[PDB]
Amino acid sequence: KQVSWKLVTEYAMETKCDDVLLLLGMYLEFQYSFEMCLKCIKKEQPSHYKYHEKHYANAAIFADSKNQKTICQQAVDTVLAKKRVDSLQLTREQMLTNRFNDLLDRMDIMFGSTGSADIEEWMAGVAWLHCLLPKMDSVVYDFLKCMVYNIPKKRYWLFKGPIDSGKTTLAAALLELCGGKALNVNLPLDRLNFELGVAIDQFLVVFEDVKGTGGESRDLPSGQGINNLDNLRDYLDGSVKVNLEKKHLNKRTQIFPPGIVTMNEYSVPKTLQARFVKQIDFRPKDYLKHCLERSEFLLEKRIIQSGIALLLMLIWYRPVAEFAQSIQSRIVEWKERLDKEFSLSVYQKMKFNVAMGIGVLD
Amino acid sequence: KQVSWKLVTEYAMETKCDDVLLLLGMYLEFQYSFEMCLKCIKKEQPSHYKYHEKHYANAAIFADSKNQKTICQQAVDTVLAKKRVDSLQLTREQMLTNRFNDLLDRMDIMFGSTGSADIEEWMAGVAWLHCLLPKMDSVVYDFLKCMVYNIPKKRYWLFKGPIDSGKTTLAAALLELCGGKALNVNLPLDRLNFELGVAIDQFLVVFEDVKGTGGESRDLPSGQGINNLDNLRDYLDGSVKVNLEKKHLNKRTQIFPPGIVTMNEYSVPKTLQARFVKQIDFRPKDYLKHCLERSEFLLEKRIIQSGIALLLMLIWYRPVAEFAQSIQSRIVEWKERLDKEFSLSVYQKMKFNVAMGIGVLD
Amino acid sequence: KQVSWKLVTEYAMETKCDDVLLLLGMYLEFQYSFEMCLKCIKKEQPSHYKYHEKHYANAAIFADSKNQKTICQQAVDTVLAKKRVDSLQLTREQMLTNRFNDLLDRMDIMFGSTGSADIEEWMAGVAWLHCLLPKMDSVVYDFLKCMVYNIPKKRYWLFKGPIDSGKTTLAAALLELCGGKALNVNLPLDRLNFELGVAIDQFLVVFEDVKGTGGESRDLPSGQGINNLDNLRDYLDGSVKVNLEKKHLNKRTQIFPPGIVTMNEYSVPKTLQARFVKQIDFRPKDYLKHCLERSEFLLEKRIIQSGIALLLMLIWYRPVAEFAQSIQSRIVEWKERLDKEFSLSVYQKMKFNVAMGIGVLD
Amino acid sequence: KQVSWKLVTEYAMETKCDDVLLLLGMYLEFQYSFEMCLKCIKKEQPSHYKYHEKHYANAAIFADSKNQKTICQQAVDTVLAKKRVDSLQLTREQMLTNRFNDLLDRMDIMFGSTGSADIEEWMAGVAWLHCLLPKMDSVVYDFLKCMVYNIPKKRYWLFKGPIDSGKTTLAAALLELCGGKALNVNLPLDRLNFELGVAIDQFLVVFEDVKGTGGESRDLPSGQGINNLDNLRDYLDGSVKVNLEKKHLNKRTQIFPPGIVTMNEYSVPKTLQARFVKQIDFRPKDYLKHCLERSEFLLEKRIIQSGIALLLMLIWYRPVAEFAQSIQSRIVEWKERLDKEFSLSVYQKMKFNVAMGIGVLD
Amino acid sequence: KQVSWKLVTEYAMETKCDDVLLLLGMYLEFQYSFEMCLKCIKKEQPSHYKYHEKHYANAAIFADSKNQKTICQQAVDTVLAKKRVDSLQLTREQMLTNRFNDLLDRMDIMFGSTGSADIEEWMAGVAWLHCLLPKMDSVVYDFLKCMVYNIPKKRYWLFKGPIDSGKTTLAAALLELCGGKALNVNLPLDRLNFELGVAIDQFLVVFEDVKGTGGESRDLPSGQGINNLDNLRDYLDGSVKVNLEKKHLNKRTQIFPPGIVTMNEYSVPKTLQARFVKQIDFRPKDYLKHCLERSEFLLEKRIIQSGIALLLMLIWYRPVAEFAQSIQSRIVEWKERLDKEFSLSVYQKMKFNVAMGIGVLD
DNA sequence: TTTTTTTT
Numbered sequence A, B, C, D, E: 001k002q003v004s005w006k007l008v009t010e011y012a013m014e015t016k017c018d019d020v021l022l023l024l025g026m027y028l029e030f031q032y033s034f035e036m037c038l039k040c041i042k043k044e045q046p047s048h049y050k051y052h053e054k055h056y057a058n059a060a061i062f063a064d065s066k067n068q069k070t071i072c073q074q075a076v077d078t079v080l081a082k083k084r085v086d087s088l089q090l091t092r093e094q095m096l097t098n099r100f101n102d103l104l105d106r107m108d109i110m111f112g113s114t115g116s117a118d119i120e121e122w123m124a125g126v127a128w129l130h131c132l133l134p135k136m137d138s139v140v141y142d143f144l145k146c147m148v149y150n151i152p153k154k155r156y157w158l159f160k161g162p163i164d165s166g167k168t169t170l171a172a173a174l175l176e177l178c179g180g181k182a183l184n185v186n187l188p189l190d191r192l193n194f195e196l197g198v199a200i201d202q203f204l205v206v207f208e209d210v211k212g213t214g215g216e217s218r219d220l221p222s223g224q225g226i227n228n229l230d231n232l233r234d235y236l237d238g239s240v241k242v243n244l245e246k247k248h249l250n251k252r253t254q255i256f257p258p259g260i261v262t263m264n265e266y267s268v269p270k271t272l273q274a275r276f277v278k279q280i281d282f283r284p285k286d287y288l289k290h291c292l293e294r295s296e297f298l299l300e301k302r303i304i305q306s307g308i309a310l311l312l313m314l315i316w317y318r319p320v321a322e323f324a325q326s327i328q329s330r331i332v333e334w335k336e337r338l339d340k341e342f343s344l345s346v347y348q349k350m351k352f353n354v355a356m357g358i359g360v361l362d
Numbered sequence F: 001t002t003t004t005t006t007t008t
């Protein structure tokens, strides 16, 4: 009649929960009967209803515990340990293979019985995106492969172009795809130390909107970024490890993650420019805005923001062999759903609408 | 029956594992039945497959205990305590001898060749590197003398040159073939005095670029570097037994570690001297880029970053007595393994190709 | 049947260890069966081999204990507490005996089984050092008892002299013998707050040359320092206690320490002169520098700044009566070495060599 | 058999010791056999020898304790509470009675059989100080009573005079007679805030060398202090509580304590002048200087600075009843002691001799 | 047997003590037998002699506890909890009624059998304050109502007049009567952030000496405060909640307290003029000056600053029904005491002769 | 004890 710390640790592992407060909160819900658990009846949250009946009996005794935070602490530690072990041992290809498996599990329930998504809407987003730039999907693949190999001195891509020209809109989807974080280099010289400290164990980073000093004749305000990146040239090249730091915790040391920069059409040092591998200079395209005006439901649902939209685009455009073996099994299934669910001229109609600037559906 | 904290502390000692999170993660892998273990079968990481057979019985009991992080702390303490003893009592030679042996062991896998690389790559590595500097081999040797003799005045070497000159990559490689840490000091020091616990218990530290107080008036970005160096002219001259402030990181009293100062072509007030072996020049020189461009495996496999790519240079030339008195058979074996495998006139291919600025493998 | 904490504390006292990782690491070395202990076989370190045989059985139980760092923390407190009892109750004369043991114990290493450096170079120092000043050894013993009696007003000697006159050099050797700190007063006034705050709690100090507004008559850089200096009478004469301070931190309130002033030959008021016991007018002088510029191995060993070479000089020159009575029984053992090893012609030759301006070793 | 924490608490109380480390160290000394205790034999510190025999039995078992520091921590907590109770509840006259009982204890040592200094030599100082200002002893009793009553506005005394007028000497002795702190207000308006925080919970403050304005018309260097004081009228007046601040801490509210001001002959605004209850000028006096020249032991033993000297003077001159009733019993025996140890003729002979400017003794 | 932690929790709740060392220190006093406790026999401190016999045995056991500070922390946190509860739940009228009860209790000691003050001197005090303004009691009654309603906009009062006019005297008395804190907005704009953190949870605040600018046309120094107050509009109007900040604590939110602004007769922006309900002008009145000269016990005993005198003014003047419902019983009884102690004739005679500036008492 | 506040 005592806490199975083991059963608690199973749940924290299986959910990948890594906040002690969230773990505590979630586990407590299992104290009441699953038998009439209205959340289970709603099938509302899988992280709840998948587990409640199994964990109920343990959670009933957990509710009486006087140690509760300590039990959750050791549970969370086990989840963090797995993250650390993986970060040292796995190849980046395998890390990314796992990241696909996570998102593909999420795409189960979104389209399952709960199913609250509409697959039509999400593919309108792909059609809008794929219309954005020539040969769109191939560019995503090239970024991902570069990110996988992590070729030293060849780690960063330049996105350039006017305000609202969609570079952030693209980038947000890429970041959700890989997992990673965003940071700002418009800050006072190398005073950014604890913000660059964010990048510990991250797979990818993205920097927003370098305020290129001197562009303001063209209404482009100046700022720190250009020369902060003139400074961080080792972080650009990645040819060395560095320290990074966070509070009431040890330092940590690693290669710095590869990433993306976004900027307006400020000038740039040709040398700093030569530290980037590649550019994408975005331009406004009115018909996409007119399309959006008539297609509000996308943004209400953040569809074009979402890495889930990119994944559907690759499942659409790419051969099955283009991805790691085990997920090819899943990718095959995700061909099947598209094959079944769309007539090809459905996508034609949709992308045809996008180009005509009508609402994507009609 | 009981968890044996002893058996855990053995594993920490033997792996030389040195973070509670890494250690905790590792040991929990053993809790599955060894006889079946897929990682043992797969032979993926020796830090597991060498040990799972032995520790499995104990890990079963470890997995149940309600205080797991405490065991890992005591075990990590033992590994760090071992390092702190040797941090005092060793001759400078035996420290460097320790550092070397592990590279030989890694080379045993690499070139006893259950590990992967083609030594031809790293011979080509030595070609690219050894071409960089007049008498580079002696430069490495002369550094090691200055290090192993801990020499006052001579305690620092000043790398002056443009960026992309390699000076930092060189310094970092000596942070491989020697232990040590990098450092930055270009700020008003008041609360920053707490940082150099990083330099406590170091044989060596490298001061990164002097972001000067004259600064961008030199076309080189500003900071507090030059004046801070001028101020701490006591410490650079080794005048002080280290009582710099901590940031949790605990105490080995020492003279401040020797090493390098680096400078992207900034100004210097002549007062800063009486305090080095010398200043040292560096330049980018296109043909070396021409070769690298034609040889970028040197960069992909990070050959040029490595201090492995300096160790191998030593083997190929020096009398074994210039190395440790004791280790001498190990180097003789590796000498033979490559003295057999090339004449100098073979990999003189690489030398003259690098000298010509042209690709360094066939 | 259990760890005796008592024996750990004895060892912690007898080592005078006061860092927890050091004590922990070392005491675990006693684990192995003492009879074969290879550190004992080699006689590596007495702090081991004088103890393992005694402590052995207890160290077995220690290694099996489940709270090791808690034992070590209490033992370290016992050692550091002893210092603070002594920090209260001891006279400056008894406190001076620390220096002598500190110096002699280090010197045992310096001429250890390693003969860590050839003691003959240290004696070649002792020779050259005595060459530098009229009645050099008496000039030291003058300063010694000057600093013992700490006599108010009668507290300070002015090291006057031109650039590169060895004043700082002798101060450095004196500061080696004695310890100290160095400070600057040419600073703007706001600095002195914390700058002088640095002087807090030290047995002796020096001031860097007072760059002073009139010296640039010579172009002696005309910092604020001399006008700044003649405000500070209460500190110098040590008549009355004074406040000191630290960044981010409180005042401290104490009698101001004694010590040394360097300067190059600015003008001064007799107002300032009266603060001093004494003045010394260094200059660079012929066969002293011109011997060293041959015998620069002593620059490389910095014996030219070695307070422990002053200690050998004292042991050579001075009556047994000149030293605190108990510790005379060590000094005799060093006298006996010097008598044999520097049989008189050895010493006489070395000094004579310097007196020929020619390499002190021949 | 258990440690008695109570005996440790009593020792911490009786020694009035409030550093956990100092307390710990001293209590350990008692574990060794009392009989042969060389500290006891040398009568080295009463804090030891007047206690070792009492505590020895408990100290031995305390030396076996596993938890030693917590015992000492609780003991220190006892003493700090006792201070804080007293600080909030005693009358000012009781606080001064405490200071006097304390000094009388130390004088029992100085002139006891241990005889650590000559009562002759200290009485030489009393004569010299009684000669420093007219009616010296009467002025001292006034000042003490003024601080004891602390009547609002009637709280501050002015010590104005040239350099080497001795005003610092008098202030030091008074501050030693009462306990208190010096302050500097030649700071700018920034630093004052933490400077005044020094005064927290003191009995006296002394303001040092307030540099006025325009003084170089009389060669006096000018500065902030006078103008700063005249803002602080409400701190001087002492009629309402003020907010006081320490670094890293919240503000505190209390009445600013009474005190003393020193300066050269600057002009004083009538506003500031009016807030002083007495002005006491000082003058240089040649016969004091020529007398003091020969009575060298006065400076070299710091007699004329010491509050022990002031306490002696009050005993020699004042009526018994003028003392608080508790110490009056001790005053009798000290008067009677001194009245044995000197005639009036002896004492008046010193005063006469000092007026002649000649070495004090014959 | 055991320590009753609950009896300590009573004693803290009883005494309202909320400092662990004051609580600790007092609780320890009781361990000696109250029967001979001289603090009891003296009845010197009510917080002792009321309680000693009651807590005797528990203190005797508490004196042997090994957990002493743990007991006290729990007790102290109980008292903090009560304040926190009341800080939310009470009305402003209850807070004022609570505050009045505290003062009445101290008055009953002061004028009790212990009688440590003379009610006639305190009544003499009341007369002088009545003469400071027209209709003084009506003014006080207006002020308190304005505070208790705390009506937005209508929250602040301005005191104005030349220096030595009584404004600070009245402010300090009103501040004692309600409780509150004083603040100095004349700082520069940065630390003013932390300055306002003092206002947290206060019933009331006072702004000192808000320095104008260009006041030197009126012989006044310029400053900063007024410009800062215009940057603080809504803090005064009390319409909206504000953020507040102490050192080393995360911010909190509340309506900023009502209060009083004080200045010498600078000019005011009409933007600032709009904040205030009312302003009161103070004129220097020499006959008060002459009265204080001849009535010194007023100042010396700090009568005229103390809120007790304002409460006496309220009791002697105001009709009973104006007081909060519960205390009307006590107030009636105190009026009855005052009518016993004085005829109106006597009070009228005091108020008369003050008007001619002769000393009060006759 | 850091981290924040102090420092700047």
Ligand SMILES: Nc1ncnc2c1ncn2[C@@H]1O[C@H](COP(=O)(O)OP(=O)(O)OP(=O)(O)O)[C@@H](O)[C@H]1O
Pocket (backbone or CB within 6 Å): A161, A162, A163, A164, A165, A166, A167, A168, A169, A170, A209, A262, A282, A283, A284, A285, A286, A288, A289, A292
């Ligand atoms: N190329 C485009 N043409 C027209 N409208 C666009 C384009 N790209 C994005 N939009 C619209 O502008 C909005 C903002 O786009 P986005 O933030 O990606 O632009 P941005 O140039 O990267 O801007 P910023 O630098 O401010 O982040 C989008 O949500 C979409 O509504």
Ligand SMILES: Nc1ncnc2c1ncn2[C@@H]1O[C@H](COP(=O)(O)OP(=O)(O)OP(=O)(O)O)[C@@H](O)[C@H]1O
Pocket (backbone or CB within 6 Å): A153, A234, A237, A239, B161, B162, B163, B164, B165, B166, B167, B168, B169, B170, B209, B262, B263, B264, B282, B283, B284, B285, B286, B287, B288, B289, B292
């Ligand atoms: N001789 C060369 N000519 C041109 N490019 C070179 C040469 N040597 C190295 N490089 C390039 O410069 C890149 C950066 O080198 P590295 O950072 O070591 O230079 P550095 O001078 O030490 O720079 P910094 O001091 O600014 O960090 C290398 O990865 C390589 O691609």
Ligand SMILES: Nc1ncnc2c1ncn2[C@@H]1O[C@H](COP(=O)(O)OP(=O)(O)OP(=O)(O)O)[C@@H](O)[C@H]1O
Pocket (backbone or CB within 6 Å): C161, C162, C163, C164, C165, C166, C167, C168, C169, C170, C209, C262, C263, C264, C282, C283, C284, C285, C286, C287, C288, C289, C290, C292, C304
């Ligand atoms: N008489 C001498 N014989 C040998 N070396 C000398 C002599 N005088 C000076 N030197 C050398 O001059 C160099 C500088 O000496 P040091 O720092 O003590 O001089 P300083 O006068 O204090 O310096 P500064 O020029 O800064 O005032 C040292 O190498 C010292 O050994």
Ligand SMILES: Nc1ncnc2c1ncn2[C@@H]1O[C@H](COP(=O)(O)OP(=O)(O)OP(=O)(O)O)[C@@H](O)[C@H]1O
Pocket (backbone or CB within 6 Å): C234, C239, D161, D162, D163, D164, D165, D166, D167, D168, D169, D170, D209, D262, D263, D283, D284, D285, D286, D288, D289, D292
């Ligand atoms: N009245 C005096 N007449 C002559 N010499 C004096 C007198 N008072 C002090 N001295 C000499 O001046 C020295 C300094 O004394 P002290 O610091 O007390 O003087 P001060 O005038 O108060 O100083 P400050 O200038 O620091 O205010 C004494 O040690 C003594 O040598």
Ligand SMILES: Nc1ncnc2c1ncn2[C@@H]1O[C@H](COP(=O)(O)OP(=O)(O)OP(=O)(O)O)[C@@H](O)[C@H]1O
Pocket (backbone or CB within 6 Å): D234, E132, E161, E162, E163, E164, E165, E166, E167, E168, E169, E170, E264, E283, E284, E285, E286, E288, E289, E292
């Ligand atoms: N009406 C008055 N007429 C003359 N003197 C007065 C008057 N009121 C107060 N005083 C005198 O002024 C002294 C100081 O009073 P108080 O501090 O309240 O003045 P203030 O003008 O408010 O000062 P500040 O503006 O400097 O804070 C009192 O102790 C008293 O001696």
